[PDB]
Amino acid sequence: MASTTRLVNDRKQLEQQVKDDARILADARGLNITTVANDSATGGQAIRNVG
Amino acid sequence: LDNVIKQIEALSVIVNRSEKADDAQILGPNTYKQLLEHLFS
Numbered sequence: 001m002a003s004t005t006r007l008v009n010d011r012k013q014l015e016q017q018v019k020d021d022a023r024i025l026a027d028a029r030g031l032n033i034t035t036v037a038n039d040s041a042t043g044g045q046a047i048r049n050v051g
Numbered sequence: 052l053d054n055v056i057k058q059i060e061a062l063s064v065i066v067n068r069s070e071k072a073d074d075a076q077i078l079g080p081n082t083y084k085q086l087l088e089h090l091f092s
Contacts, residue, residue, distance in 0.1 A: 048073045 046073075049075055051075075
């Protein structure tokens with residue numbers, strides 16, 4: 001049990017830190033939403049009256 | 052003379068499968084009609 005047994009955990013922590021500090025410097029820009037539309041209807045059979 | 056009505060029943064059932072739209076429940080716009088009117092003074 002030496003400093004070599006901590007290598008995998010060291011890599012786990014290093015990957016977490018790399019992701020975290022690459023998220024900080026990444027530039028973020030808003031995007032335009034162009035998908036709004038009322039196209040989600042439902043079908044079926046009409047309940048026609050009889051008489 | 053026994054199968055003369057079997058064909059009728061089969062044709063009635065088959066045409067019953069041809070779906071037909073019904074306006075029985077649907078109404079439409081309308082206007083009052085103007086009646087001939089002569090007025091003088």
